[PDB]
Amino acid sequence: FVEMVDNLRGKSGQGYYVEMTVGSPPQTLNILVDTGSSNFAVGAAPHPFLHRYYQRQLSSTYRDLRKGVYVPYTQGKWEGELGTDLVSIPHGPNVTVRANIAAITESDKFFINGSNWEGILGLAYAEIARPDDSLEPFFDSLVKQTHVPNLFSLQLCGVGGSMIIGGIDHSLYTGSLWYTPIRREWYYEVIIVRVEINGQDLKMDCKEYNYDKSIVDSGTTNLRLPKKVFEAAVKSIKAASSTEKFPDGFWLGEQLVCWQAGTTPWNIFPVISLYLMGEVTNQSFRITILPQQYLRPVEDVATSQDDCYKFAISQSSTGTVMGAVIMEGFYVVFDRARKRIGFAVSACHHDEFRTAAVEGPFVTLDMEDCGYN
Numbered sequence: 001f002v003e004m005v006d007n008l009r010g011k012s013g014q015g016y017y018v019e020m021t022v023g024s025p026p027q028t029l030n031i032l033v034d035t036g037s038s039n040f041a042v043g044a045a046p047h048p049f050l051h052r053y054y055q056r057q058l059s060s061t062y063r064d065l066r067k068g069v070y071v072p073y074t075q076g077k078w079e080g081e082l083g084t085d086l087v088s089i090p091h092g093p094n095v096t097v098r099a100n101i102a103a104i105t106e107s108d109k110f111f112i113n114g115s116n117w118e119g120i121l122g123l124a125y126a127e128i129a130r131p132d133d134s135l136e137p138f139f140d141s142l143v144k145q146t147h148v149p150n151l152f153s154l155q156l157c158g159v160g161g162s163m164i165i166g167g168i169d170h171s172l173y174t175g176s177l178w179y180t181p182i183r184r185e186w187y188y189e190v191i192i193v194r195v196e197i198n199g200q201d202l203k204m205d206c207k208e209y210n211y212d213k214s215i216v217d218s219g220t221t222n223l224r225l226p227k228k229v230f231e232a233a234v235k236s237i238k239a240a241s242s243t244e245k246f247p248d249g250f251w252l253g254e255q256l257v258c259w260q261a262g263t264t265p266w267n268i269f270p271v272i273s274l275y276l277m278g279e280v281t282n283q284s285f286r287i288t289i290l291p292q293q294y295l296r297p298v299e300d301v302a303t304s305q306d307d308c309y310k311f312a313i314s315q316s317s318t319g320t321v322m323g324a325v326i327m328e329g330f331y332v333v334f335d336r337a338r339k340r341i342g343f344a345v346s347a348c349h350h351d352e353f354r355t356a357a358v359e360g361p362f363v364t365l366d367m368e369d370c371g372y373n
């Protein structure tokens with residue numbers, strides 16, 4: 001696993017990617033790591049934002065599946081043609097597998113100018129693959145075709161980080177690993193049982209936190225919350241930070257807030273705790289996130305007399321999304337073999353006053369199931 005450490009790169013706010021090769025002879029591409037979807041897809045024709053792309057006609061091992069595919073995400077969409085080819089991860093396990101690949105031929109608001117990645121690795125389950133669940137996802141192929149154990153973990157550092165395939169690297173975290181069940185195998189779906197802001201409970205029925213599912217998604221930046229939960233959370237964050245007033249556009253994630261370089265007032269912003277269902281009845285643990293995680297710096301030389309930030313919590317109409325802002329400075333273990341997700345504090349986490357945490361146990365008397373439907 002040391003060979004896999006620091007195998008992820010990224011531009012701030014533009015996506016974490018791993019190097020892969022596709023085809024025979026190997027064509028090198030940088031591929032976005034996405035636990036929020038299940039299609040492996042690569043740019044396969046010119047695009048103003050791509051420095052390189054998959055050339056199927058140079059690969060003797062390419063097999064055309066004679067089927068088109070269209071994938072509309074929350075942000076962005078693409079379409080292209082299915083086939084299969086040999087794939088390897090130079091800084092992953094030492095194996096070469098034959099995998100499904102979508103050759104993207106048209107796209108809209110999907111590739112990002114300057115992001116350095118040319119494709120996406122959907123690491124979730126076949127139930128949400130397009131065009132349907134018969135298209136085996138990459139990680140499934142890898143496990144079936146090799147001896148790699150059925151689990152991977154991600155340490156995203158807010159850029160670089162590590163994707164450890166087939167295991168857990170103890171150098172990447174401290175303290176204990178706490179596990180929450182994967183509720184259903186489609187997305188990495190989990191259940192939040194409680195939310196607090198500065199230790200104050202939001203006080204809603206816990207099904208609202210999971211309306212109509214809650215997922216762990218490395219392919220989305222923000223923590224995204226159902227409308228009712230989002231409005232409650234903003235109200236409580238505004239209340240805690242009320243010594244300064246910000247425009248509504250800031251709270252809507254449409255406008256930056258800036259402070260003279262070095263003077264960001266971290267202390268006025270609250271910590272947010274998300275309590276995740278535990279492995280034992282009515283037990284939970286919490287992960288705590290600091291404003292350094294949910295106020296995302298926007299690098300722009302033009303504004304660089306200041307430190308400028310966007311509010312990285314937003315409203316969702318498709319359930320909770322624990323995006324990269326939540327994953328950053330946790331080590332997150334996708335323990336597919338045991339149908340659970342592990343969290344620990346990451347070696348790449350804080351202030352001289354507060355530190356992000358993963359801790360438990362917490363018990364609740366309330367017998368409600370927090371799962372939505």
Ligand SMILES: Cc1cc2cc(c1)C(=O)N[C@@H](c1ccccc1)C/C=C/COC[C@@H]([C@H](O)CNCc1cccc(C(C)C)c1)NC2=O
Binds near residue numbers: 034071
């Ligand atoms: C609002 C928003 C949504 C999404 C991405 C971003 C922003 C974004 O800004 N992402 C960038 C990034 C930067 C820094 C860190 C992490 C990500 C770069 C990543 C692009 C890849 O997009 C991946 C996609 C992810 O699969 C979504 N999962 C739920 C889902 C919803 C609908 C359909 C489907 C499947 C089943 C087809 C899944 N993310 C976004 O939609």
